[PDB]
Amino acid sequence: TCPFYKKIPGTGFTVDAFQYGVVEGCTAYFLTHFHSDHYAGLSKHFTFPVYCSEITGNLLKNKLHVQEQYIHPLPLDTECIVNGVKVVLLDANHCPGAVMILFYLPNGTVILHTGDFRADPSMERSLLADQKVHMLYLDTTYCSPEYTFPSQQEVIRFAINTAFEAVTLNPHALVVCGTYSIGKEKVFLAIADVLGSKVGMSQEKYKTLQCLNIPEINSLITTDMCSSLVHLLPMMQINFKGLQSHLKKCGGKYNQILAFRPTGWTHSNKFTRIADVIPQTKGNISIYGIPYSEHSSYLEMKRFVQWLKPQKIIPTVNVGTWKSRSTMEKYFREWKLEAGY
Ligand code: NI
Question: How far is the CA of 311 from the centre of ligand 1 (A)?
Fold first, then answer.
């Protein structure tokens, strides 16, 4: 049974609610982005209307084989009428094709569902600037002040400089980057660009990347691993055993691996600056964990909500424990008292 925080009151609509079977009363199913916790349940046998971005729609059709007749892509930043209700999709600054959804209820209520997002001051100048929001369905993944991490730009600066140094010292070093879903593509694309290489990867991963409308992509990626000195591998293989085994396969072309694991937040964030990050090393293999986040830090979250001034907040993440829920509710009230709404 579908939980309440995936239902939009006063509509026939659900958000990210594909694993509950046929939801009673649902005339349109929205999908914010193509991450498995959110799409869980979609397949070629789904026969209800799915509303999403163009990029999400490319992925539904090519990766999950959803039939074309049930996929309804919408342009961003554009007022659209769905089953008699005005909606707008906004960029969520999450993974490619990820959106927030503004719903303009027939009774005059305005609702924002963030999906998964990384808040940014640029959102304060989208179509959100123009009206009041009564209810906010909020990605609270990192809603506690211990969650700090650097900008995405500082993280990519670290990665490019690290990769370029290592390979210039040893032209026989291979760079490897971990992946398990879409998102975080700037990591491997930025490093390949500084090295003058294409990124090499499996046919399944190449297929996924070809659905993402990234400019000039045929110029940046390839399935010919032999022509590439930046390889992508599944995240599970980014360990000393898995990397050793990969290096065997490269036929003595390389004698060192430098590897990157983009994580979310990790507790080494509470002590160490990005500049000071060091790898784990065994022999001719080094692994860097880099805190490249596609979710709001606590401060970024707080700034967005204090700017938006919603009347009511409904968390969509960390909702399963009473201690989590109580913690989040305390921060929401602080924010409201400090800002005066
Ligand atoms: Ni996500």
Answer: 25
